[PDB]
Amino acid sequence: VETFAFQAEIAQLMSLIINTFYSNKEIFLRELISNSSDALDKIRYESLTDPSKLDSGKELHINLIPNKQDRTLTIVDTGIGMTKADLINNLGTIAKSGTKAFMEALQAGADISMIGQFGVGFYSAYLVAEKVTVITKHNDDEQYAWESSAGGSFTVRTDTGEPMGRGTKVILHLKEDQTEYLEERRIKEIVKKHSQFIGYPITLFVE
Ligand SMILES: COc1cccc(-c2cc(F)ccc2[C@H]2Cc3nc(N)nc(C)c3C(=O)N2)n1
């Protein structure tokens, strides 16, 4: 298990998300579904010039899986996935610029729901989760588990768990007061409200 420091700017963003009073927490789901959709668009387009990129799985979809026993909501996609370099180097580079812009927008009167416009919507997971675990597999790289409970550090390890083919699984370990996001009716309401035109099947699993 390797432990890494977030860039100061990203730690600052995470603290803002965790600490700011903001009741409209439900937007985390739209942000993660949007990320999944982008990842699916990316593998689909790449496969037009290299069909072998789908050898790791042809089906392009999103699953939402609540588990009341574990108190987790998992968002699974069969998108492009992330390499180790993405997790430790590349995504932090884009996150730095997006965070700066988002901060400027907030000072000028924007609100937290607009986070996705700045390309850093992933961190909205921390509106509802005390810990986020991400399992990811990109073609030609290993399966990794990324994890963070904020506090300025994240971990990465090679994942020896259930092989996933290709894609990303975001596992939200929900805060004690955010268990509404495990309820079928609530998730259905939110998907209908904010994610109705996503161009991939979204299957809401039941418990
Ligand atoms: C999903 O897990 C993680 C872990 C660390 C950082 C990010 C991240 C951060 C950003 F600022 C902007 C974008 C991302 C991710 C968001 C993402 N989600 C999904 N489902 N799939 C992919 C390929 C990505 C991706 O390419 N980038 N995402």
Side-chain angles (χ1 to χ4, degrees), residues 35-36 39 77 80-82 91 94-95 119-120 122-123 134 146 168 170:
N35 287 350
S36 292
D77 66 70
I80 193 150
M82 288 168 290
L91 294 168
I94 43 97
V120 291
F122 168 71
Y123 300 99
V134 179
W146 178 104
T168 298
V170 177

Side-chain angles (χ1 to χ4, degrees), residues 57-77:
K58 288 189 166 177
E59 194 185 1
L60 302 179
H61 62 76
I62 298 164
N63 292 157
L64 307 178
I65 310 178
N67 189 300
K68 281 167 197 278
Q69 287 73 37
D70 298 339
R71 204 206 292 161
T72 55
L73 179 64
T74 302
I75 298 83
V76 185
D77 66 70

Side-chain angles (χ1 to χ4, degrees), residues 116 156 204:
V156 179
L204 173 54

Side-chain angles (χ1 to χ4, degrees), residues 78-98:
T78 51
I80 193 150
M82 288 168 290
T83 63
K84 203 185 178 187
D86 289 331
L87 294 169
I88 72 163
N89 267 282
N90 300 338
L91 294 168
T93 308
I94 43 97
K96 188 172 173 178
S97 48

